[PDB]
Design a protein around this nucleic acid. Structure first.
Length: 59
DNA sequence: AGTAATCCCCTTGGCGGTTAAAACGCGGGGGACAGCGCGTACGTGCGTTTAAGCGGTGCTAGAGCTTGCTACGACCAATTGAGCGGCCTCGGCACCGGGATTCTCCA
């Protein structure tokens, strides 16, 4: 495959959300998950909805 | 709930070059423009007659207004697929080159 892991910004996942939906992930890292701590944040609402089989938070 | 940092995006600005488009020079041609003569075609004046304008009489079509209701569109909630945003590709149109046909101008 042309990739195994994909690195991206907390900014792009909310901006390109319509492309991030329509995709399915085997594993996900959130690399400094204190970015997610506001449940009112769009980056909480969006990354929550990413179809991912197992998820990990780093903090 | 507020105000500031963070980050995307998209517009403005600068630098280099390259070359295609703008500027410049110069001869000559022919088109703009003033000048002339004529002649016919438009403005003038008169006598003619024609009907537009006014004051007046008569009628009825139909503009304008009210009454009464029911047929038709406004409004809402649930359903779904027609239409939009994103990705792909291949074929139409351009772009080039080269030889063939046309048109232009001086002889």
């Amino acid at each position: 495959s042309p990739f195994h892991v994909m690195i991206t910004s907390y900014q792009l996942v909310v901006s390109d959300v319509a492309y991030f939906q329509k995709m399915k992930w085997q594993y996900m890292i959130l690399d400094e998950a204190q970015a997610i701590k506001s449940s009112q944040s769009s980056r909480w609402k969006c990354l929550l909805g990413f179809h991912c089989r197992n998820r990990l938070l780093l903090t």
